[PDB]
């Protein structure tokens, strides 16, 4: 009874609890509550949504089908978070 794909895991939960804790430590915190994980997942999802939306807009304007690193840099700079290192 498993011809369908009943087995699957959500993608946002791939951002593991210890990964959240590693980010938190590099930030410099000492104790983390239990709901920081869910809230962080939500915040990261929203940020990625915005940036990827702008990048995809650039790529589809250029009449392409690949999102280039330079297009991502353009989208990120437009959001106002200029990134040094990936060209441009």
């Amino acid at each position: 009874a498993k011809r369908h794909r009943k087995v699957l895991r959500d993608n946002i939960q791939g951002i593991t609890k210890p990964a959240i804790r590693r980010l938190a430590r590099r930030g410099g915190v000492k104790r983390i509550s239990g709901l920081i994980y869910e809230e962080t997942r939500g915040v990261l999802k929203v940020f990625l949504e915005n940036v990827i939306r702008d990048a995809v807009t650039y790529t589809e304007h250029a009449k392409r089908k690949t999102v280039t690193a330079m297009d991502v840099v353009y989208a990120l700079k437009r959001q106002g978070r200029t990134l040094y290192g990936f060209g441009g």
Partner: protein
Amino acid sequence: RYRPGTVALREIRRYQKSTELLIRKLPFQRLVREIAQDFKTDLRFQSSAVMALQEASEAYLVALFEDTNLCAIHAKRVTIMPKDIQLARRIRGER
């Protein structure tokens, strides 16, 4: 064994020295593809593009966690909570 907080300060020292990536590579890359599925079907992604996305995401989350920690310390605490992170985002003109 160790008194509480010792390993925490040790890990802060560990992770403020390093410059590596903190989120796993493939889980983040899969998340990026899945979240980019809806805007337009059949998009390709090159490794440099995904790496730039991960760099931006990590920097954003690290700065956010610094702001959250400062909020928590302001309220006479040491644990961070969703109240703290919500205040930090909404005071930065994001929420």
